[PDB]
From TrEMBL, chains A, B:
Keyword Isomerase: no
The protein's annotated pathway: Cofactor biosynthesis; riboflavin biosynthesis; 2-hydroxy-3-oxobutyl phosphate from D-ribulose 5-phosphate: step 1/1
Protein name: 3,4-dihydroxy-2-butanone 4-phosphate synthase
Organism from which the protein derives: Acinetobacter baumannii
Pfam families xref list: DHBP_synthase, GTP_cyclohydro2
GN (gene name): ribB
Binding annotation for D-ribulose 5-phosphate: R24, E25, D29, R135, A136, G137, H138, T139
InterPro entries according to UniProt: DHBP_synth_RibB-like_a/b_dom (IPR017945), DHBP_synthase_RibB (IPR000422), GTP_cyclohydro_II (IPR032677), RibA-like_sf (IPR036144)
Residues holding Mg(2+) 1: E25
Binding site for Mg(2+) 2: E25, H138
């Protein structure tokens, strides 16, 4: 149940079960280091999980493999399956050993494109560059887990479907985990781990800007994996004591109501998360991964700025959400 | 120089020169209705324009042809080339007649995919659904122009390259137009025509909203081709006299400085253009087609709301910017 054990089992060559957010796909995947995969591992997967056995790859390894996305644009789920994979010690490629062998060719250290062919019976998945920092899928989660084991960022994953024929949910996954001696994890638990044990954000440049509220200092930040720009509007020296803080994600209702505006003034640090696009005003008007993503970026920004005790302009968070950072940074959470 | 003649020459089967915005591509294309294209028309193109001869198609026509975009994602210029086109009365397909013959097969009324093959030597281009309403390219312009002549929304277009070997600009295109007896046109001038002689925008539903400025009526609008859902916040009954108006496109001056809010308050109609995405605050921080797009959508909204005389909260517009909507609507542009 603990991220550090999950990494240790993956290094050890064992499997691990990984759950995503219950308001995402809400599924459990067996997860093993693709480098340590063995025939009997594929056989366990197709037998007691009976989902699609898939092979999570990095974008680098896909380029090294000359292996693109099989579909690019779809319509008006989100999942990057690839052209199917086969090796060339293969007859049909659907046997457990041969499938294992197909994985071996793909994730070999110095693999070439001619070590592999398409189509096949192994189904590679291309993680996004920054991994579970941005997309909280099993694809990114299998890779980033294997990376933490010091292995090739490659994992083999298979959905766990109940004997009933429906998708095993947390209840059924916990039983299955203990029935077979496997530990379990939340990729959201992996987000917060990565945010706690890694320098994920780097500062870019400082500026001074003149606003109707006053003068602010702009710290422009960038996070590994993604070209987005996170901001911090600072007044004063947040190392000067308690700092009045808002971590801030856009929500197209400023144009009508007023929260960010009513937040610019009680600055008399404001964080801002970059996203590749900001929703337009019209459309329609948990996500624990998106929460730990947000406040993890917001937390590394405030730590880099020297924040040590905060006056939050947010409604209360998840309870221990801010654990892993400077101290218990919150003494007073705001009203309206 | 005048849109209605440009439509009339296309109906007659002659060519017309179309320029895009001086800051987009800044090129002139010969443009002829693909349905009226003849061997000697292709030959004039490859001789005295010497760009790529291309065949603008609608998405309907492309689907009927089973004919996709040849690249889907590349790198995030913007141009929708297709898999190359060839017919089957062709030997090589590069002759003036054979290219002309290839076009005919594509734009024949009830053409099939088996009327046509790939690759070839004609280069079809897929316009976006709403045409020149959204993308102000020669591709959309060739189709919409041919449509206005009541013909198949299909045109053949070719870049006009100087004898010098560089791209003919307005000066050189104007000379070329008169040397060969052709009329010349601006895609922006076609934008404004469509906005003046077509009902392009339709409302969806009315609502009431409660805001910190007060209560508004929400009019949701959609425009042909739908990259958008447009809004109009109304206070009062604009049909009872003068209306204080702002047409509003998003920009950095909402979160940091204060214009939109300082527009919410003087509403004691605010229009809002739908955008496929709203730029984030970090990134980096004429387009005359995009202007006539803006105020044409904003103008059909304000007429639909019954606006006839305005007090604009904008800085002054282009001269004759409005020109077609609900007589001379502006007496008072309001200050900073
Ligand atoms: Cl195979
Ligand atoms: Cl050809």
């Amino acid at each position: 149940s603990r991220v550090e054990e999950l990494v240790a089992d993956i290094r050890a060559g064992k499997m691990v079960i990984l759950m995503d957010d219950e308001d995402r796909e809400n599924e459990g995947d067996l997860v093993i280091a693709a480098t340590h995969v063995r025939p009997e591992d594929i056989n366990f997967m197709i037998t007691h999980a009976r989902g699609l056995v898939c092979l999570t790859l990095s974008r680098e390894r896909c380029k090294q493999l000359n292996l693109p996305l099989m579909v690019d644009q779809n319509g008006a789920g989100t999942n990057f399956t690839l052209s199917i994979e086969a090796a060339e010690g293969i007859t049909t490629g659907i046997s457990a050993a041969e499938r294992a062998h197909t994985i071996q060719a793909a994730v070999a250290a110095h693999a070439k494109p001619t070590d592999i062919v398409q189509p096949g019976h192994i189904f590679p998945l291309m993680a996004q560059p920054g991994g579970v920092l941005h997309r909280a899928g099993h694809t990114e989660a299998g890779c980033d887990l294997a990376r933490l084991a010091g292995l090739e960022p490659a994992s083999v994953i298979c959905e766990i479907i109940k004997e009933d024929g429906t998708m095993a949910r947390r209840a059924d996954l916990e039983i299955f985990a203990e029935k077979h001696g496997l530990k379990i994890g939340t990729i959201a638990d992996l987000i917060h781990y990565r945010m706690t044990n890694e320098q994920t954000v780097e500062r870019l440049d400082q500026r001074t800007i003149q606003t109707e509220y006053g003068s602010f200092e702009l710290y422009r930040y960038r996070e590994i994996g993604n070209p987005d720009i996170h901001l911090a509007l600072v007044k004063g020296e947040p190392k000067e004591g308690v700092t009045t803080v808002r971590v801030h994600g856009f929500s197209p209702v400023r144009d009508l109501l007023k929260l960010n505006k009513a937040d610019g003034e009680p600055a008399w640090v404001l964080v801002w998360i970059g996203q590749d696009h900001l929703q337009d005003l019209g459309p329609a008007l948990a996500a624990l991964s998106h929460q730990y993503q947000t406040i993890g970026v917001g937390a590394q920004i405030l730590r880099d700025l020297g924040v040590e005790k905060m006056k939050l302009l947010s409604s209360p968070l998840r309870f221990n959400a801010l654990s892993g950072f400077n101290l218990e940074v919150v003494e007073y959470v705001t009203a309206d």
